[PDB]
PDB file of all heavy atoms in Angstrom:
ATOM      1  N   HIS L 165       8.779  -6.459 -15.516  1.00  0.00           N
ATOM      2  CA  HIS L 165       8.285  -7.480 -14.600  1.00  0.00           C
ATOM      3  C   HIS L 165       9.221  -7.641 -13.416  1.00  0.00           C
ATOM      4  O   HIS L 165      10.139  -8.461 -13.439  1.00  0.00           O
ATOM      5  CB  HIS L 165       8.125  -8.816 -15.330  1.00  0.00           C
ATOM      6  CG  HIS L 165       7.540  -9.908 -14.484  1.00  0.00           C
ATOM      7  ND1 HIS L 165       6.468  -9.709 -13.641  1.00  0.00           N
ATOM      8  CD2 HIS L 165       7.884 -11.211 -14.356  1.00  0.00           C
ATOM      9  CE1 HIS L 165       6.176 -10.845 -13.029  1.00  0.00           C
ATOM     10  NE2 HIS L 165       7.019 -11.770 -13.446  1.00  0.00           N
ATOM     11  N   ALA L 166       8.980  -6.845 -12.380  1.00  0.00           N
ATOM     12  CA  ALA L 166       9.793  -6.903 -11.180  1.00  0.00           C
ATOM     13  C   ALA L 166       9.459  -8.180 -10.428  1.00  0.00           C
ATOM     14  O   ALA L 166      10.326  -8.800  -9.813  1.00  0.00           O
ATOM     15  CB  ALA L 166       9.544  -5.686 -10.311  1.00  0.00           C
ATOM     16  N   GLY L 167       8.193  -8.571 -10.481  1.00  0.00           N
ATOM     17  CA  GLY L 167       7.756  -9.782  -9.815  1.00  0.00           C
ATOM     18  C   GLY L 167       7.445  -9.549  -8.350  1.00  0.00           C
ATOM     19  O   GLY L 167       7.049  -8.448  -7.954  1.00  0.00           O
ATOM     20  N   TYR L 168       7.612 -10.587  -7.540  1.00  0.00           N
ATOM     21  CA  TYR L 168       7.222 -10.512  -6.145  1.00  0.00           C
ATOM     22  C   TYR L 168       8.423 -10.354  -5.236  1.00  0.00           C
ATOM     23  O   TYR L 168       9.432 -11.041  -5.399  1.00  0.00           O
ATOM     24  CB  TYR L 168       6.465 -11.776  -5.749  1.00  0.00           C
ATOM     25  CG  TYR L 168       5.285 -12.070  -6.636  1.00  0.00           C
ATOM     26  CD1 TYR L 168       5.210 -13.258  -7.348  1.00  0.00           C
ATOM     27  CD2 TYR L 168       4.242 -11.166  -6.757  1.00  0.00           C
ATOM     28  CE1 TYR L 168       4.134 -13.533  -8.158  1.00  0.00           C
ATOM     29  CE2 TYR L 168       3.161 -11.433  -7.568  1.00  0.00           C
ATOM     30  CZ  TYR L 168       3.112 -12.619  -8.262  1.00  0.00           C
ATOM     31  OH  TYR L 168       2.034 -12.885  -9.072  1.00  0.00           O
ATOM     32  N   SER L 169       8.297  -9.467  -4.255  1.00  0.00           N
ATOM     33  CA  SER L 169       9.366  -9.265  -3.293  1.00  0.00           C
ATOM     34  C   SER L 169       9.392 -10.443  -2.337  1.00  0.00           C
ATOM     35  O   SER L 169       8.425 -10.693  -1.616  1.00  0.00           O
ATOM     36  CB  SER L 169       9.152  -7.962  -2.523  1.00  0.00           C
ATOM     37  OG  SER L 169      10.005  -7.896  -1.395  1.00  0.00           O
ATOM     38  N   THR L 170      10.505 -11.169  -2.340  1.00  0.00           N
ATOM     39  CA  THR L 170      10.691 -12.274  -1.414  1.00  0.00           C
ATOM     40  C   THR L 170      11.224 -11.703  -0.113  1.00  0.00           C
ATOM     41  O   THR L 170      11.461 -12.430   0.852  1.00  0.00           O
ATOM     42  CB  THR L 170      11.690 -13.308  -1.961  1.00  0.00           C
ATOM     43  OG1 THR L 170      12.976 -12.694  -2.118  1.00  0.00           O
ATOM     44  CG2 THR L 170      11.223 -13.840  -3.311  1.00  0.00           C
ATOM     45  N   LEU L 171      11.382 -10.381  -0.095  1.00  0.00           N
ATOM     46  CA  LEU L 171      11.892  -9.670   1.070  1.00  0.00           C
ATOM     47  C   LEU L 171      11.016  -8.462   1.334  1.00  0.00           C
ATOM     48  O   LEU L 171      11.377  -7.340   0.996  1.00  0.00           O
ATOM     49  CB  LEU L 171      13.332  -9.219   0.822  1.00  0.00           C
ATOM     50  CG  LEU L 171      14.122  -8.691   2.019  1.00  0.00           C
ATOM     51  CD1 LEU L 171      14.446  -9.845   2.925  1.00  0.00           C
ATOM     52  CD2 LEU L 171      15.409  -8.005   1.571  1.00  0.00           C
ATOM     53  N   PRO L 172       9.843  -8.697   1.934  1.00  0.00           N
ATOM     54  CA  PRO L 172       8.821  -7.660   2.080  1.00  0.00           C
ATOM     55  C   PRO L 172       9.246  -6.552   3.034  1.00  0.00           C
ATOM     56  O   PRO L 172       9.740  -6.820   4.128  1.00  0.00           O
ATOM     57  CB  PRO L 172       7.648  -8.429   2.689  1.00  0.00           C
ATOM     58  CG  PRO L 172       8.287  -9.545   3.443  1.00  0.00           C
ATOM     59  CD  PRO L 172       9.445  -9.959   2.584  1.00  0.00           C
ATOM     60  N   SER L 173       9.042  -5.311   2.620  1.00  0.00           N
ATOM     61  CA  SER L 173       9.249  -4.182   3.506  1.00  0.00           C
ATOM     62  C   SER L 173       7.931  -3.916   4.220  1.00  0.00           C
ATOM     63  O   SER L 173       6.872  -4.339   3.750  1.00  0.00           O
ATOM     64  CB  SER L 173       9.678  -2.960   2.705  1.00  0.00           C
ATOM     65  OG  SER L 173       8.960  -2.893   1.490  1.00  0.00           O
ATOM     66  N   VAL L 174       7.998  -3.222   5.353  1.00  0.00           N
ATOM     67  CA  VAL L 174       6.807  -2.851   6.100  1.00  0.00           C
ATOM     68  C   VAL L 174       5.853  -2.040   5.224  1.00  0.00           C
ATOM     69  O   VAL L 174       4.650  -2.325   5.164  1.00  0.00           O
ATOM     70  CB  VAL L 174       7.191  -2.014   7.333  1.00  0.00           C
ATOM     71  CG1 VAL L 174       5.950  -1.499   8.043  1.00  0.00           C
ATOM     72  CG2 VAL L 174       8.028  -2.840   8.284  1.00  0.00           C
ATOM     73  N   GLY L 175       6.404  -1.042   4.538  1.00  0.00           N
ATOM     74  CA  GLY L 175       5.629  -0.184   3.657  1.00  0.00           C
ATOM     75  C   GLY L 175       4.817  -0.956   2.634  1.00  0.00           C
ATOM     76  O   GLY L 175       3.654  -0.633   2.380  1.00  0.00           O
ATOM     77  N   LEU L 176       5.419  -1.992   2.058  1.00  0.00           N
ATOM     78  CA  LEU L 176       4.740  -2.814   1.059  1.00  0.00           C
ATOM     79  C   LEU L 176       3.558  -3.573   1.686  1.00  0.00           C
ATOM     80  O   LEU L 176       2.454  -3.631   1.113  1.00  0.00           O
ATOM     81  CB  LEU L 176       5.754  -3.777   0.419  1.00  0.00           C
ATOM     82  CG  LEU L 176       5.362  -4.491  -0.877  1.00  0.00           C
ATOM     83  CD1 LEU L 176       5.036  -3.486  -1.963  1.00  0.00           C
ATOM     84  CD2 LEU L 176       6.459  -5.441  -1.355  1.00  0.00           C
ATOM     85  N   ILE L 177       3.780  -4.105   2.887  1.00  0.00           N
ATOM     86  CA  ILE L 177       2.755  -4.847   3.618  1.00  0.00           C
ATOM     87  C   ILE L 177       1.549  -3.948   3.912  1.00  0.00           C
ATOM     88  O   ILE L 177       0.392  -4.274   3.567  1.00  0.00           O
ATOM     89  CB  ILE L 177       3.312  -5.357   4.982  1.00  0.00           C
ATOM     90  CG1 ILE L 177       4.524  -6.277   4.786  1.00  0.00           C
ATOM     91  CG2 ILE L 177       2.240  -6.046   5.799  1.00  0.00           C
ATOM     92  CD1 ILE L 177       4.290  -7.406   3.818  1.00  0.00           C
ATOM     93  N   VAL L 178       1.819  -2.804   4.536  1.00  0.00           N
ATOM     94  CA  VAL L 178       0.739  -1.904   4.939  1.00  0.00           C
ATOM     95  C   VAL L 178       0.074  -1.188   3.760  1.00  0.00           C
ATOM     96  O   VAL L 178      -1.099  -0.807   3.846  1.00  0.00           O
ATOM     97  CB  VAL L 178       1.207  -0.879   5.997  1.00  0.00           C
ATOM     98  CG1 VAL L 178       1.687  -1.600   7.246  1.00  0.00           C
ATOM     99  CG2 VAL L 178       2.312  -0.004   5.434  1.00  0.00           C
ATOM    100  N   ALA L 179       0.802  -1.029   2.656  1.00  0.00           N
ATOM    101  CA  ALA L 179       0.203  -0.449   1.459  1.00  0.00           C
ATOM    102  C   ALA L 179      -0.760  -1.453   0.841  1.00  0.00           C
ATOM    103  O   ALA L 179      -1.837  -1.080   0.359  1.00  0.00           O
ATOM    104  CB  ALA L 179       1.274  -0.047   0.450  1.00  0.00           C
ATOM    105  N   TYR L 180      -0.384  -2.730   0.868  1.00  0.00           N
ATOM    106  CA  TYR L 180      -1.271  -3.758   0.333  1.00  0.00           C
ATOM    107  C   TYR L 180      -2.544  -3.854   1.181  1.00  0.00           C
ATOM    108  O   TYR L 180      -3.677  -3.857   0.651  1.00  0.00           O
ATOM    109  CB  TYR L 180      -0.565  -5.108   0.339  1.00  0.00           C
ATOM    110  CG  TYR L 180      -0.185  -5.607  -1.034  1.00  0.00           C
ATOM    111  CD1 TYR L 180       1.145  -5.634  -1.435  1.00  0.00           C
ATOM    112  CD2 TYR L 180      -1.147  -6.073  -1.921  1.00  0.00           C
ATOM    113  CE1 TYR L 180       1.512  -6.100  -2.683  1.00  0.00           C
ATOM    114  CE2 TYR L 180      -0.793  -6.539  -3.177  1.00  0.00           C
ATOM    115  CZ  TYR L 180       0.542  -6.550  -3.552  1.00  0.00           C
ATOM    116  OH  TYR L 180       0.915  -7.009  -4.796  1.00  0.00           O
ATOM    117  N   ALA L 181      -2.355  -3.906   2.499  1.00  0.00           N
ATOM    118  CA  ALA L 181      -3.486  -3.957   3.417  1.00  0.00           C
ATOM    119  C   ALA L 181      -4.381  -2.741   3.204  1.00  0.00           C
ATOM    120  O   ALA L 181      -5.608  -2.851   3.237  1.00  0.00           O
ATOM    121  CB  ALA L 181      -3.008  -4.023   4.855  1.00  0.00           C
ATOM    122  N   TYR L 182      -3.763  -1.586   2.980  1.00  0.00           N
ATOM    123  CA  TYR L 182      -4.509  -0.365   2.701  1.00  0.00           C
ATOM    124  C   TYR L 182      -5.337  -0.480   1.425  1.00  0.00           C
ATOM    125  O   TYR L 182      -6.481  -0.024   1.387  1.00  0.00           O
ATOM    126  CB  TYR L 182      -3.561   0.831   2.604  1.00  0.00           C
ATOM    127  CG  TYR L 182      -4.232   2.133   2.230  1.00  0.00           C
ATOM    128  CD1 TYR L 182      -4.990   2.839   3.152  1.00  0.00           C
ATOM    129  CD2 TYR L 182      -4.073   2.676   0.964  1.00  0.00           C
ATOM    130  CE1 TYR L 182      -5.593   4.038   2.817  1.00  0.00           C
ATOM    131  CE2 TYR L 182      -4.669   3.874   0.617  1.00  0.00           C
ATOM    132  CZ  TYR L 182      -5.424   4.552   1.548  1.00  0.00           C
ATOM    133  OH  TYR L 182      -6.018   5.740   1.200  1.00  0.00           O
ATOM    134  N   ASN L 183      -4.781  -1.102   0.389  1.00  0.00           N
ATOM    135  CA  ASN L 183      -5.531  -1.261  -0.850  1.00  0.00           C
ATOM    136  C   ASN L 183      -6.760  -2.157  -0.661  1.00  0.00           C
ATOM    137  O   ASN L 183      -7.880  -1.814  -1.091  1.00  0.00           O
ATOM    138  CB  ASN L 183      -4.635  -1.819  -1.954  1.00  0.00           C
ATOM    139  CG  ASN L 183      -3.670  -0.786  -2.507  1.00  0.00           C
ATOM    140  OD1 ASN L 183      -4.008   0.385  -2.651  1.00  0.00           O
ATOM    141  ND2 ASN L 183      -2.451  -1.220  -2.805  1.00  0.00           N
ATOM    142  N   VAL L 184      -6.560  -3.288   0.012  1.00  0.00           N
ATOM    143  CA  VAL L 184      -7.666  -4.212   0.250  1.00  0.00           C
ATOM    144  C   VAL L 184      -8.728  -3.552   1.142  1.00  0.00           C
ATOM    145  O   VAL L 184      -9.933  -3.685   0.902  1.00  0.00           O
ATOM    146  CB  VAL L 184      -7.172  -5.537   0.878  1.00  0.00           C
ATOM    147  CG1 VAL L 184      -8.323  -6.302   1.516  1.00  0.00           C
ATOM    148  CG2 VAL L 184      -6.490  -6.397  -0.169  1.00  0.00           C
ATOM    149  N   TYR L 185      -8.269  -2.817   2.153  1.00  0.00           N
ATOM    150  CA  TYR L 185      -9.155  -2.116   3.079  1.00  0.00           C
ATOM    151  C   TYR L 185      -9.989  -1.061   2.360  1.00  0.00           C
ATOM    152  O   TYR L 185     -11.179  -0.910   2.635  1.00  0.00           O
ATOM    153  CB  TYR L 185      -8.342  -1.443   4.189  1.00  0.00           C
ATOM    154  CG  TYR L 185      -9.184  -0.681   5.191  1.00  0.00           C
ATOM    155  CD1 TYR L 185      -9.752  -1.329   6.282  1.00  0.00           C
ATOM    156  CD2 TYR L 185      -9.414   0.682   5.048  1.00  0.00           C
ATOM    157  CE1 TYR L 185     -10.527  -0.643   7.205  1.00  0.00           C
ATOM    158  CE2 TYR L 185     -10.190   1.378   5.966  1.00  0.00           C
ATOM    159  CZ  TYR L 185     -10.743   0.710   7.040  1.00  0.00           C
ATOM    160  OH  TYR L 185     -11.511   1.397   7.952  1.00  0.00           O
ATOM    161  N   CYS L 186      -9.353  -0.312   1.465  1.00  0.00           N
ATOM    162  CA  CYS L 186     -10.047   0.733   0.723  1.00  0.00           C
ATOM    163  C   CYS L 186     -11.099   0.143  -0.189  1.00  0.00           C
ATOM    164  O   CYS L 186     -12.228   0.636  -0.236  1.00  0.00           O
ATOM    165  CB  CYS L 186      -9.072   1.568  -0.107  1.00  0.00           C
ATOM    166  SG  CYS L 186      -8.136   2.761   0.829  1.00  0.00           S
ATOM    167  N   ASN L 187     -10.734  -0.914  -0.911  1.00  0.00           N
ATOM    168  CA  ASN L 187     -11.717  -1.581  -1.756  1.00  0.00           C
ATOM    169  C   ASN L 187     -12.866  -2.147  -0.926  1.00  0.00           C
ATOM    170  O   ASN L 187     -14.000  -2.226  -1.397  1.00  0.00           O
ATOM    171  CB  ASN L 187     -11.079  -2.686  -2.596  1.00  0.00           C
ATOM    172  CG  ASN L 187     -12.059  -3.308  -3.569  1.00  0.00           C
ATOM    173  OD1 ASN L 187     -12.519  -4.430  -3.372  1.00  0.00           O
ATOM    174  ND2 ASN L 187     -12.388  -2.575  -4.628  1.00  0.00           N
ATOM    175  N   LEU L 188     -12.565  -2.526   0.313  1.00  0.00           N
ATOM    176  CA  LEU L 188     -13.553  -3.116   1.213  1.00  0.00           C
ATOM    177  C   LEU L 188     -14.682  -2.135   1.527  1.00  0.00           C
ATOM    178  O   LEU L 188     -15.858  -2.505   1.525  1.00  0.00           O
ATOM    179  CB  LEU L 188     -12.875  -3.533   2.520  1.00  0.00           C
ATOM    180  CG  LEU L 188     -13.739  -4.176   3.605  1.00  0.00           C
ATOM    181  CD1 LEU L 188     -14.026  -5.589   3.213  1.00  0.00           C
ATOM    182  CD2 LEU L 188     -13.058  -4.147   4.966  1.00  0.00           C
ATOM    183  N   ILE L 189     -14.311  -0.887   1.804  1.00  0.00           N
ATOM    184  CA  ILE L 189     -15.263   0.146   2.207  1.00  0.00           C
ATOM    185  C   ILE L 189     -15.662   1.086   1.067  1.00  0.00           C
ATOM    186  O   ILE L 189     -16.146   2.190   1.309  1.00  0.00           O
ATOM    187  CB  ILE L 189     -14.709   0.985   3.383  1.00  0.00           C
ATOM    188  CG1 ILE L 189     -13.453   1.739   2.951  1.00  0.00           C
ATOM    189  CG2 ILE L 189     -14.403   0.097   4.583  1.00  0.00           C
ATOM    190  CD1 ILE L 189     -12.997   2.795   3.942  1.00  0.00           C
ATOM    191  N   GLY L 190     -15.456   0.648  -0.172  1.00  0.00           N
ATOM    192  CA  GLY L 190     -15.926   1.394  -1.328  1.00  0.00           C
ATOM    193  C   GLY L 190     -15.196   2.698  -1.593  1.00  0.00           C
ATOM    194  O   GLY L 190     -15.702   3.557  -2.316  1.00  0.00           O
ATOM    195  N   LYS L 191     -14.004   2.847  -1.025  1.00  0.00           N
ATOM    196  CA  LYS L 191     -13.178   4.022  -1.287  1.00  0.00           C
ATOM    197  C   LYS L 191     -12.309   3.833  -2.531  1.00  0.00           C
ATOM    198  O   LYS L 191     -11.528   2.880  -2.617  1.00  0.00           O
ATOM    199  CB  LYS L 191     -12.289   4.335  -0.082  1.00  0.00           C
ATOM    200  CG  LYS L 191     -11.367   5.525  -0.313  1.00  0.00           C
ATOM    201  CD  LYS L 191     -12.188   6.770  -0.632  1.00  0.00           C
ATOM    202  CE  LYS L 191     -11.310   7.967  -0.941  1.00  0.00           C
ATOM    203  NZ  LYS L 191     -12.079   9.058  -1.609  1.00  0.00           N
ATOM    204  N   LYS L 192     -12.447   4.747  -3.488  1.00  0.00           N
ATOM    205  CA  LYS L 192     -11.840   4.589  -4.811  1.00  0.00           C
ATOM    206  C   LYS L 192     -10.776   5.646  -5.139  1.00  0.00           C
ATOM    207  O   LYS L 192     -10.763   6.726  -4.543  1.00  0.00           O
ATOM    208  CB  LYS L 192     -12.923   4.551  -5.894  1.00  0.00           C
ATOM    209  CG  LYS L 192     -14.134   3.718  -5.502  1.00  0.00           C
ATOM    210  CD  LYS L 192     -14.712   2.988  -6.704  1.00  0.00           C
ATOM    211  CE  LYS L 192     -15.992   2.250  -6.343  1.00  0.00           C
ATOM    212  NZ  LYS L 192     -16.438   1.359  -7.454  1.00  0.00           N
ATOM    213  N   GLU L 193      -9.886   5.309  -6.076  1.00  0.00           N
ATOM    214  CA  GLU L 193      -8.774   6.174  -6.487  1.00  0.00           C
ATOM    215  C   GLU L 193      -7.847   6.512  -5.316  1.00  0.00           C
ATOM    216  O   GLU L 193      -7.805   7.652  -4.845  1.00  0.00           O
ATOM    217  CB  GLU L 193      -9.266   7.454  -7.184  1.00  0.00           C
ATOM    218  CG  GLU L 193      -9.447   7.341  -8.706  1.00  0.00           C
ATOM    219  CD  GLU L 193     -10.581   6.419  -9.124  1.00  0.00           C
ATOM    220  OE1 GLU L 193     -11.483   6.173  -8.298  1.00  0.00           O
ATOM    221  OE2 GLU L 193     -10.569   5.941 -10.280  1.00  0.00           O
ATOM    222  N   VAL L 194      -7.101   5.513  -4.849  1.00  0.00           N
ATOM    223  CA  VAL L 194      -6.210   5.708  -3.712  1.00  0.00           C
ATOM    224  C   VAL L 194      -4.763   5.338  -4.029  1.00  0.00           C
ATOM    225  O   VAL L 194      -3.987   5.061  -3.113  1.00  0.00           O
ATOM    226  CB  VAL L 194      -6.673   4.856  -2.507  1.00  0.00           C
ATOM    227  CG1 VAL L 194      -8.010   5.354  -1.992  1.00  0.00           C
ATOM    228  CG2 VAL L 194      -6.772   3.390  -2.897  1.00  0.00           C
ATOM    229  N   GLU L 195      -4.405   5.350  -5.315  1.00  0.00           N
ATOM    230  CA  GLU L 195      -3.080   4.925  -5.762  1.00  0.00           C
ATOM    231  C   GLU L 195      -2.001   5.743  -5.067  1.00  0.00           C
ATOM    232  O   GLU L 195      -1.064   5.197  -4.462  1.00  0.00           O
ATOM    233  CB  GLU L 195      -2.938   5.109  -7.276  1.00  0.00           C
ATOM    234  CG  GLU L 195      -3.631   4.050  -8.119  1.00  0.00           C
ATOM    235  CD  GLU L 195      -5.068   4.430  -8.442  1.00  0.00           C
ATOM    236  OE1 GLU L 195      -5.478   5.557  -8.087  1.00  0.00           O
ATOM    237  OE2 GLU L 195      -5.787   3.608  -9.052  1.00  0.00           O
ATOM    238  N   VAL L 196      -2.174   7.060  -5.142  1.00  0.00           N
ATOM    239  CA  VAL L 196      -1.223   8.023  -4.607  1.00  0.00           C
ATOM    240  C   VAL L 196      -1.150   7.896  -3.092  1.00  0.00           C
ATOM    241  O   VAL L 196      -0.062   7.919  -2.507  1.00  0.00           O
ATOM    242  CB  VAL L 196      -1.633   9.469  -4.996  1.00  0.00           C
ATOM    243  CG1 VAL L 196      -0.760  10.496  -4.291  1.00  0.00           C
ATOM    244  CG2 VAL L 196      -1.535   9.656  -6.497  1.00  0.00           C
ATOM    245  N   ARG L 197      -2.311   7.755  -2.461  1.00  0.00           N
ATOM    246  CA  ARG L 197      -2.374   7.649  -1.009  1.00  0.00           C
ATOM    247  C   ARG L 197      -1.690   6.395  -0.492  1.00  0.00           C
ATOM    248  O   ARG L 197      -0.985   6.432   0.519  1.00  0.00           O
ATOM    249  CB  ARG L 197      -3.823   7.651  -0.529  1.00  0.00           C
ATOM    250  CG  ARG L 197      -4.551   8.959  -0.703  1.00  0.00           C
ATOM    251  CD  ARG L 197      -5.966   8.804  -0.191  1.00  0.00           C
ATOM    252  NE  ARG L 197      -6.765  10.008  -0.364  1.00  0.00           N
ATOM    253  CZ  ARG L 197      -8.059  10.074  -0.078  1.00  0.00           C
ATOM    254  NH1 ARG L 197      -8.675   9.008   0.403  1.00  0.00           N
ATOM    255  NH2 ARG L 197      -8.731  11.200  -0.262  1.00  0.00           N
ATOM    256  N   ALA L 198      -1.904   5.292  -1.199  1.00  0.00           N
ATOM    257  CA  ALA L 198      -1.281   4.024  -0.854  1.00  0.00           C
ATOM    258  C   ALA L 198       0.233   4.131  -1.014  1.00  0.00           C
ATOM    259  O   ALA L 198       0.989   3.696  -0.142  1.00  0.00           O
ATOM    260  CB  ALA L 198      -1.835   2.909  -1.724  1.00  0.00           C
ATOM    261  N   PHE L 199       0.667   4.709  -2.131  1.00  0.00           N
ATOM    262  CA  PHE L 199       2.093   4.898  -2.401  1.00  0.00           C
ATOM    263  C   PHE L 199       2.772   5.717  -1.306  1.00  0.00           C
ATOM    264  O   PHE L 199       3.769   5.281  -0.721  1.00  0.00           O
ATOM    265  CB  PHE L 199       2.275   5.582  -3.763  1.00  0.00           C
ATOM    266  CG  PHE L 199       3.656   6.149  -3.995  1.00  0.00           C
ATOM    267  CD1 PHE L 199       4.727   5.316  -4.275  1.00  0.00           C
ATOM    268  CD2 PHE L 199       3.871   7.521  -3.970  1.00  0.00           C
ATOM    269  CE1 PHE L 199       5.998   5.839  -4.506  1.00  0.00           C
ATOM    270  CE2 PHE L 199       5.136   8.051  -4.201  1.00  0.00           C
ATOM    271  CZ  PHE L 199       6.200   7.208  -4.470  1.00  0.00           C
ATOM    272  N   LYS L 200       2.212   6.888  -1.008  1.00  0.00           N
ATOM    273  CA  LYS L 200       2.779   7.765   0.015  1.00  0.00           C
ATOM    274  C   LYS L 200       2.784   7.081   1.378  1.00  0.00           C
ATOM    275  O   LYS L 200       3.724   7.247   2.166  1.00  0.00           O
ATOM    276  CB  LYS L 200       1.987   9.077   0.111  1.00  0.00           C
ATOM    277  CG  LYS L 200       2.091   9.996  -1.102  1.00  0.00           C
ATOM    278  CD  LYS L 200       1.558  11.394  -0.771  1.00  0.00           C
ATOM    279  CE  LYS L 200       1.753  12.360  -1.935  1.00  0.00           C
ATOM    280  NZ  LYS L 200       1.200  13.717  -1.650  1.00  0.00           N
ATOM    281  N   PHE L 201       1.732   6.311   1.645  1.00  0.00           N
ATOM    282  CA  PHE L 201       1.593   5.610   2.913  1.00  0.00           C
ATOM    283  C   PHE L 201       2.690   4.566   3.084  1.00  0.00           C
ATOM    284  O   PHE L 201       3.301   4.463   4.150  1.00  0.00           O
ATOM    285  CB  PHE L 201       0.218   4.943   2.996  1.00  0.00           C
ATOM    286  CG  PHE L 201      -0.016   4.181   4.269  1.00  0.00           C
ATOM    287  CD1 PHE L 201       0.087   4.809   5.503  1.00  0.00           C
ATOM    288  CD2 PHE L 201      -0.365   2.839   4.230  1.00  0.00           C
ATOM    289  CE1 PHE L 201      -0.137   4.107   6.677  1.00  0.00           C
ATOM    290  CE2 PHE L 201      -0.597   2.131   5.399  1.00  0.00           C
ATOM    291  CZ  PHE L 201      -0.483   2.766   6.624  1.00  0.00           C
ATOM    292  N   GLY L 202       2.936   3.791   2.032  1.00  0.00           N
ATOM    293  CA  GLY L 202       3.966   2.771   2.085  1.00  0.00           C
ATOM    294  C   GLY L 202       5.359   3.358   2.190  1.00  0.00           C
ATOM    295  O   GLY L 202       6.191   2.881   2.975  1.00  0.00           O
ATOM    296  N   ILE L 203       5.618   4.402   1.404  1.00  0.00           N
ATOM    297  CA  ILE L 203       6.933   5.036   1.405  1.00  0.00           C
ATOM    298  C   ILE L 203       7.232   5.624   2.784  1.00  0.00           C
ATOM    299  O   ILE L 203       8.322   5.414   3.342  1.00  0.00           O
ATOM    300  CB  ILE L 203       7.012   6.156   0.348  1.00  0.00           C
ATOM    301  CG1 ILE L 203       6.892   5.573  -1.065  1.00  0.00           C
ATOM    302  CG2 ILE L 203       8.299   6.946   0.501  1.00  0.00           C
ATOM    303  CD1 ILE L 203       7.760   4.359  -1.313  1.00  0.00           C
ATOM    304  N   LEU L 204       6.261   6.344   3.343  1.00  0.00           N
ATOM    305  CA  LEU L 204       6.440   6.933   4.667  1.00  0.00           C
ATOM    306  C   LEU L 204       6.604   5.821   5.703  1.00  0.00           C
ATOM    307  O   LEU L 204       7.422   5.930   6.621  1.00  0.00           O
ATOM    308  CB  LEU L 204       5.244   7.814   5.037  1.00  0.00           C
ATOM    309  CG  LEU L 204       5.526   9.223   5.582  1.00  0.00           C
ATOM    310  CD1 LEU L 204       4.374   9.738   6.443  1.00  0.00           C
ATOM    311  CD2 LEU L 204       6.835   9.296   6.346  1.00  0.00           C
ATOM    312  N   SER L 205       5.840   4.744   5.540  1.00  0.00           N
ATOM    313  CA  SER L 205       5.901   3.639   6.486  1.00  0.00           C
ATOM    314  C   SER L 205       7.283   3.000   6.528  1.00  0.00           C
ATOM    315  O   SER L 205       7.852   2.849   7.611  1.00  0.00           O
ATOM    316  CB  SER L 205       4.834   2.583   6.195  1.00  0.00           C
ATOM    317  OG  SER L 205       3.559   3.022   6.627  1.00  0.00           O
ATOM    318  N   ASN L 206       7.848   2.643   5.377  1.00  0.00           N
ATOM    319  CA  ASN L 206       9.176   2.035   5.436  1.00  0.00           C
ATOM    320  C   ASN L 206      10.314   3.032   5.646  1.00  0.00           C
ATOM    321  O   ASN L 206      11.440   2.638   5.945  1.00  0.00           O
ATOM    322  CB  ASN L 206       9.435   1.010   4.311  1.00  0.00           C
ATOM    323  CG  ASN L 206       9.375   1.608   2.930  1.00  0.00           C
ATOM    324  OD1 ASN L 206       9.523   2.816   2.751  1.00  0.00           O
ATOM    325  ND2 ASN L 206       9.139   0.756   1.933  1.00  0.00           N
ATOM    326  N   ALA L 207      10.005   4.323   5.537  1.00  0.00           N
ATOM    327  CA  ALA L 207      10.947   5.353   5.974  1.00  0.00           C
ATOM    328  C   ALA L 207      10.948   5.553   7.492  1.00  0.00           C
ATOM    329  O   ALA L 207      11.959   5.958   8.063  1.00  0.00           O
ATOM    330  CB  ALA L 207      10.665   6.661   5.275  1.00  0.00           C
ATOM    331  N   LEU L 208       9.819   5.288   8.144  1.00  0.00           N
ATOM    332  CA  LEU L 208       9.701   5.576   9.575  1.00  0.00           C
ATOM    333  C   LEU L 208       9.633   4.341  10.472  1.00  0.00           C
ATOM    334  O   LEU L 208       9.941   4.429  11.658  1.00  0.00           O
ATOM    335  CB  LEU L 208       8.490   6.476   9.864  1.00  0.00           C
ATOM    336  CG  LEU L 208       8.554   7.932   9.398  1.00  0.00           C
ATOM    337  CD1 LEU L 208       7.359   8.707   9.920  1.00  0.00           C
ATOM    338  CD2 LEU L 208       9.851   8.592   9.835  1.00  0.00           C
ATOM    339  N   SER L 209       9.241   3.194   9.926  1.00  0.00           N
ATOM    340  CA  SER L 209       9.085   2.010  10.765  1.00  0.00           C
ATOM    341  C   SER L 209      10.444   1.456  11.171  1.00  0.00           C
ATOM    342  O   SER L 209      11.441   1.670  10.485  1.00  0.00           O
ATOM    343  CB  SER L 209       8.265   0.926  10.056  1.00  0.00           C
ATOM    344  OG  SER L 209       8.780   0.664   8.766  1.00  0.00           O
TER     345      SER L 209
END
């Protein structure tokens, strides 16, 4: 139980938005894509 980050990284923010967005448009099985997206995001932002 890591719990909630009280110190949000950019990657975490955009990965969450990506998850909600994907569910919004009926796109399924995006675990890996969300992960890679967040990792790359906080590596480059």
Side-chain angles (χ1 to χ4, degrees):
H165 184 43
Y168 306 120
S169 167
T170 63
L171 191 71
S173 39
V174 174
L176 195 59
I177 301 308
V178 299
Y180 251 109
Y182 176 75
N183 285 322
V184 162
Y185 180 86
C186 283
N187 185 254
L188 180 76
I189 64 168
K191 178 59 183 164
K192 318 216 185 189
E193 271 68 21
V194 294
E195 283 90 5
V196 172
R197 291 180 182 175
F199 165 75
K200 292 194 176 178
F201 179 57
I203 295 313
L204 229 205
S205 284
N206 62 21
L208 290 187
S209 51

